[PDB]
Amino acid sequence: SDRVAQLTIGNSTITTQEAANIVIAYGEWPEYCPDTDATAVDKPTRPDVSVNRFFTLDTKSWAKDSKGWYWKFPDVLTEVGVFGQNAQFHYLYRSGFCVHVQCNASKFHQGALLVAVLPEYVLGTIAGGTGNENSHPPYATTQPGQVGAVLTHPYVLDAGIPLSQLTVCPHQWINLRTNNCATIIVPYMNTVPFDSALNHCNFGLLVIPVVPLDFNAGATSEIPITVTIAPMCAEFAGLRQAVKQ
């Protein structure tokens, strides 16, 4: 009654028999932009079921020495399904998201993944090691797309901030002996009512193994981690020709 759950939206349904509740980021549900906050005057387009449905991105392999991964929203979907198309044809965009990270093992495996949502996840470089080089992250690192990227220094989240404090953000743990997934519902967060789905990532999703994976030789060693996400209340405005970036 708290470990079992079903998420149905659009023409997609997700099930799980070993959940650990669901988190509503900052206690707020996604919602279309009201007339008091809106500023752009054109009537928005709200595709509904064609874009607010679950999308499953590539799977990652959890190894005994994995550092962790991260994805950026809405970057991950800017080129997938009808959502991507609306994101490319419109200047303005806004929406919430239902993030469902999946990972199952056996009652003999062990390990804990911290799944968190960090809004405005700005990355930094190691500054040439010495700190005298003012280098910057490449486009491929700031917006890794659907494939996601790997963290090089998880301890400081590749941004000079302690991973030990990441729990101050909406999050769940996927502790193999307890649950096999994490679910976080994220509302739209920005200083503006709508924004470019191409030039700005509202938040990043981080999956980091704080407690390394471990198992005895002989047990299945391919332990994948899959990410399935669903836009919620997706709105679009400022229609024109398609633009990829």
In angstroms, the Cα distances linking 163 to 74, 155, 241 are 23, 5, 41
Does 4 contact a second copy by CB under 8 A?
no
CA 179, 181, 185, 190: dihedral to nearest 10 degrees? 120
11 vs 199, beta carbon nearer a second copy:
11
Does 47 contact a second copy by CB under 8 A?
yes
Helix (H, G, I), strand (E, B) or coil at 149: strand
52 vs 202, beta carbon nearer a second copy:
52
Binding partner selected for residue 70 from other proteins, a second copy, none, CB under the kind-specific 5 to 8 Å limit: none
66 vs 88, beta carbon nearer a second copy:
88
Tell me the helices (H) and strands (E) count for the chain, helix number first.
Answer: 2, 13
CB of 165 to a second copy, least distance (A): 28
Helix (H, G, I), strand (E, B) or coil at 86: helix
Does 104 contact a second copy by CB under 8 A?
no
For the chain, the maximum distance between any two Cα atoms, rounded to a whole number of angstroms, is: 62
28 vs 214, beta carbon nearer a second copy:
214
**Window contacting a second copy (CB under 8 A); options: 28-36, 46-54, 133-141, 187-195:** 46-54
Does 236 contact a second copy by CB under 8 A?
yes
Does 119 contact a second copy by CB under 8 A?
no
CA 203, 149, 13, 196: dihedral to nearest 10 degrees? 40
41 vs 168, beta carbon nearer a second copy:
41
- Rule CB under 8 A: choose which of 9, 32, 46, 173 binds a second copy: 46
Binding partner selected for residue 85 from other proteins, a second copy, none, CB under the kind-specific 5 to 8 Å limit: a second copy
What residues between 139 and 158 interact with a second copy by CB under 8 A?
none
Binding partner selected for residue 1 from a second copy, other proteins, none, CB under the kind-specific 5 to 8 Å limit: none
CA 175, 159, 146, 74: dihedral to nearest 10 degrees? 100
- Which positions ≥6 away from 229 have C-beta within 8 Å? 54, 55, 57, 73, 76, 77, 97, 98, 99, 100
Does 50 contact a second copy by CB under 8 A?
yes
Q: Where do runs of H (alpha helix) occur along 134-242? A: 139-142
What is the pairing mode between strands 203-214 and 110-119? Answer: antiparallel
**Residues near a second copy (CB under 8 A):** 10-11, 42-50, 53, 81-82, 85-86, 89-90, 236, 239
